[model samples]
Target chain A: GQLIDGVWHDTWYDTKSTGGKFQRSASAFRNWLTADGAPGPTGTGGFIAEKDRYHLYVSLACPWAHRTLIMRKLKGLEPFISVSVVNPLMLENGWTFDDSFPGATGDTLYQNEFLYQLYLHADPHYSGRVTVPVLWDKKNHTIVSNESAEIIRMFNTAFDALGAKAGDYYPPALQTKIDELNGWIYDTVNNGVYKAGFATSQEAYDEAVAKVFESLARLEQILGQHRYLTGNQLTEADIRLWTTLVRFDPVYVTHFKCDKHRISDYLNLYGFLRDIYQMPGIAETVNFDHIRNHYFRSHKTINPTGIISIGPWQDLDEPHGRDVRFG
Target chain B: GQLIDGVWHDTWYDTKSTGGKFQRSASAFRNWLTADGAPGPTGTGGFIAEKDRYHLYVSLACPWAHRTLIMRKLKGLEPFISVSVVNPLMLENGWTFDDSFPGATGDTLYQNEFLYQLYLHADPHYSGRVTVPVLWDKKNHTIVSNESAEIIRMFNTAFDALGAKAGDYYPPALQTKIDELNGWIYDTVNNGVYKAGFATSQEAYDEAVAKVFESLARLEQILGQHRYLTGNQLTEADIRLWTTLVRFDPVYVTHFKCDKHRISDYLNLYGFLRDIYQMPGIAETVNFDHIRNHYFRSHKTINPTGIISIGPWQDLDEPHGRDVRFG
Candidate 1:
């Protein structure tokens, strides 16, 4: 196991032990950054939101990191905050940047060889799981936030004054309801698939898979009423859920063992996925090649040879009927 | 890797090292006992066909083995040949008879521990792979043949004197054409997918995937004029190719990386698969649980967590336009 100073050991995903439940590690740096320089949920001093003071690092294959990419594009902050992506294949050293591996972009900062080096840079003795979507604060030369969920929220508000649109995804009014929906969807559907896909035990697999279908059934009914997860208006909640839902049929439905039913098989969920996918510039954020290779190839213990699937050719470009309701 | 006393060794269908070329192994035994005492292609004979003289061993998950089951039912040989099915999950020892493996039946012949162990009894120095559709000669206590292609051919004949209908599948007139077409279809479509799925190199994967689509495109065009591969009459060629084609979209198209396009997307090929599936006693040979589990769970190298897909719900029982050609 590769680690920095005997901290942050390289660990391959162990799905068989969780009863096949995918137990994701909690984000190490959960601090929130606000535009008004207010101390947010879980980090350090609030730096006033400014243009070109932050850079984002991500892996195209990661669903969590993809959330930030979608938010960056949707909020029109691509130009303001420059971004770089790591390669999809995570091997023995766990998510490296050698550029020899397919689809991997080497680290831009410190010309780093490995990802854990960045974690060690944050604190010489920092001991935690090193993950992507690291928001770098160029002003202080420190990480602003490494958590994608928090980064999405930061993208929603922090850089608004620097020409980003008035995209009130997590509006002050609907915060309560959005949080509620996010909790359930995160547990059963969004993260539920990981739980099911990574589960090692029969009981864990059974539990995670059962909840996956139950959550999907619930979302099918929920989306049947509102166009998005929270409501008719698109919210941060949609961005969070859409990242997982878009990958549900192609990657998670098969690779992750969340195969109770495909999202395409569900009437509303399939259409809803197309609805979100049809959003302007969102397709750029979605890469089937990255997603497929990452899940199938990266985890050799799960898929040893990493034979990427070629199809289940979904027609996301087809006309979605949601326009009739909105029209 | 299991070998006994320099005698019997268990070989398997290795998806790797084929270098994107599917080379199916020849069965160890090739003996055949027809109704009127005739020698087979490669092994000793003189055991005339009797009602209860022979038996079959199959795995519901295997398309190759499923062909024999379908042929046995179609030829009205079900009452004559007793059968035992191994479980879908083939582990370190290859196909086993453990009941806990799901759909596996305990060995009926001497209640052997493993399928290869049975082969050891027949020939202590058996060196070839242990595959299914084994025809057991009870009187002689040896295997008649383990090849599916030959077993189906044997089922086509051999039992003529037992009062069963001798379906003229490999008719003398059509043998030349059948052999020609089967060669192309087998390489490009039947085994083309395994080549693509198990390919170790990028060039191999791309090449194999291309051939799979090319063959499907050719078949789709052929079915436009003729009802089946051999045309007008459904011959042994149709049965052989149908088993692979039928499982294409559901399993191979996505699971096996043969995903240039789904069989459902192909108008003629889709109908052809449905037509064969709807044929009398053919659907009974299909066990989705076996098919799903075998590929997803057994091939941990391909699917890490062994999660099966649950979509692209197909209608094999749907009506087809093939009767127009027959009319």
Candidate 2:
């Protein structure tokens, strides 16, 4: 029930105003953990990327956190950067280090009771909503970045010296196109859902929700032509959008009220989601229990009862035929 | 957005807390108008039921309101009692008489702009939730009853003078058993949902949600024995619970977060829902568009974006062997 002055408060991000409009706040710390000790946008200086130097804290239920998790797996950072997960049922204290929830590891970095304590340790008076995929600098004894987008980018290429797998999620050549796509997708599809789900005002909800479906329709049509968001090659833009889309039907559509036609119903996009999911190691990262429980059980504002649904049985393993046509 | 001083604001009825948990508020007006001066519960003294003298106001999205619409068709009250429908999007004003939404009708009586205005006109300061199946006494310029339970009872027996022939939903010999069954089902299953969905606190939600699933499990077991809730006969109890059960998979399980399991996955309950839905006049009463639209669009607190789901395609017309088994 209490918020920390500069630490992690067990709390949910408030998107509601008395007027019923949903607006999302930005990530507080925007530092990057680059291999070359390059300065990140925010936070204290000189935290170089090294093997076993950083740890990650994530919730499988969160799409934002999922981005970093997927990048960690894809970049083969599993050996270098270790992880600790929190329970899906983020109650009064928010994103607990409860062990009962499968795949959730109690805070391995600090062995702290609550996530807020870690946040407070990082910044004594850190104000703003506490989020997931926090990159902990164990040696520096501070948080490098709690921003998922940056963490994933850092994961994409930062730890090359540490022998992490070489996969260019954000290739240098496609940066401009990916940036443009990220802007639209982030606004309309990614954060647009939160805007719609948490909107305290009717006007905000209406606008944001329309954009969500419109983006879905747009993406569906685009996938019909090209495989990925930035055309043929897979990139970080795809990963960013995939996290949200993967969780769409199971949690976001129902729990968040972003119900404008499920992703399974979309002709091209459904298959696209399946193709990505069926890719090696991707499906393993998706935890339905975490996703369903977190949204339904934790967000009392939207789903007060937190009763998890068990239907609309989807098969990501089913034949997508994307490879047959394009590969 | 304005609420009348002492009037029941157009709000969802909370059956969770009355010191005696799950205590439902009885619909304030319970009087019925029969062909003869058949003494009913409350309201004005003598208003003989005549053909075309009554009208119904309903929202297809509302499980409570859907009951009256079903009874109206089954009892052949379409000719005798005219009907008007409200938009599924019940907003701040609550269940508005907006015609922009499909299947919605502006109030015929007094042509009022909103549903609460009609409630106020019915009683200067009606102090309860404004609900549906408002059986209007057109001749007397007043409401007969706003309660679906009593209205269905009236629909079952009252308008015989108009040659209505839908068969008895409430039979005499099984009255006590039906009442007993209805009590548990309403407590554990029907109103049990609102109890869980509206719970503000975690302790309240966990307790109420557990009861909901427990009731579902109980019903699944009971349904293994009987064809309907009231044993052999498809009585009023069936009608009452059917409305809620029909919406179970599509809306309630997802929107209300009553998801222990979907109705589709339950062997007995799925076939049971299909059986009742396949009944001659029943399917006609169910309008999925209205049902999905209202729940997703309205109730902004639960689903801010109001994006309707297009999914879980259930075949209500699928063969049901209940008749052979019961016989």
Candidate 3:
């Protein structure tokens, strides 16, 4: 759980800085890609959605990276945007291109030894925690965007004009609802897991974990009333929420200490998770081997010995009779 | 997790000594108490069971000590033997007579600061892990027996002559079967949790946890057909097994990393645990605060941050329906 600042340094998140609350650093590279190479949403954005121009650097372990991976599958962006998966075991140098892990692909662009190297390649004086789901513009020879939320939005429809598959996760009618849901869901559910897991004090953990369950319980009740988050059709809200839900029982329940109630404890929630997971190409995006190893191994402050728990055995392949009820 | 050899040394269990497998030290004191002055099963014994003749030192958190606690309640020995409970948080100094924790009645006999002091009083050169459920002979001013297994046996029948309530957990008719059940149950289930929790290697944990589940699965199947461990009688086997089962979902599942399958996962096993819990004066002996704090707080090596998991929530108070099922 170390960081890099033009140079790699031994460190982990200093939760004491926030009084034990884990505050995730907002992604630095916040540019956007569009069909016409238009400029500015958050940064200089002449980044066009061109095939073989944009490359995705991600970790199969990360939930945020997972959202982009899911969008790539749903919108058929794999052929257009290339990908390199960093090793699951993040250490002193942070996310690495180590090919030792089964699913990890070494840095495909410049054959960088560590993920920080790619960040440095884009910005020589880049200083912060080097993270994954980096949309590197091969044409520009720099990082286009490191934010998954915006990258998935770019993947949602930007590539459609260039023969990408027909998909509309963020529909005009659902954008208002999707935007609204993604706000608190990201704060309390997605980042909430991180908040609870990385908490150095009991107070921080109690606050974070309470919000996580409160949000989950609400989602359970909400899902019970509808198929997807908005209505009959699945959207970006589901995609964003699905990444966290998929990891809940497997890692979050045990690793994050969000064990008051599991996703399995809820009918609608578990069914929705399984329902989305059993979708044509969605299950392939979920890599438990990577997910489990990354959190349990890297977070040495939380789990010091690095001995992984072989438990919370779940079978997402089980029948989720959601289609009949929803249809 | 240090030990005292007339002096305290900062150290944890040396699992590397036995190829990463945790081997518990056998209890040193093994003297037995009888209705009258007598020789022992394994030690010289002039120990006699009489009203207020012996004192029992125990920890509410400890399952091994819990067996003796349950026995005292069942055999109606409350008025006969005085008891003291050590604080749940076992530090490097070992079990303390710290009265900060509720239900902890510091060393009432001598007001010793640490449990090691009691061991020192019994033997100045005592060089083993100071443990609880110590049956101290007040008349002799020394420890009668430090072994809970043997102490529970003494509580079972030794006090019957002094008008103990009518109970025979180890009936002659079921002695062979009870003895046989206790043998593997002790090795695989009773001590198996320890083997898994204290394991320093993956192989040791894998080997130990597998045995634990195997034993539980067998017990679940066995309990499905029978009301008690050995037919209709709730024998010592049930009492011994109950202590571990009570702590399983609450602490063992998370703290010990024995979360492959919960006690709630098995219908018969959960029902059996619930049935035993519903027994007269049984639930009073189980103290989750002590149990949770002891393992999660004390075992610093296993849980570095000392963060306790609030999970695997079970309602043992729920009706088990065992009476209609097997009675």
Q: What is the lDDT of residue B82 in candidate 2?
A: 83
iRMSD, per candidate, in listed order? 3.6, 5.3, 1.3
Off by more than 4 A, model 3: A1-5, A12-27, B1-28
Judging by TM-score, tell me the better candidate of 1 and 3: 3
lDDT of 3: 0.84
Give each model's clash number.
22, 18, 0
Error of 1 at B317 (Å): 4.4
For candidate 1 chain B, the 10 contiguous residues with the lowest summed lDDT are B18-27
Clashing pairs in 3: none
Q: Cα deviation in Å at residue A287, candidate 3? A: 1.2
Predicted complexes: DockQ each: 0.37, 0.17, 0.65
Cα error, candidate 1, residue A299 (Å): 1.2
The whole-model lDDT of each prediction reads: 0.76, 0.76, 0.84
Which structure among the candidates has the greatest lDDT?
3
User: What TM-score goes with each of the models?
Assistant: 0.84, 0.67, 0.94
Error of 1 at B112 (Å): 4.4
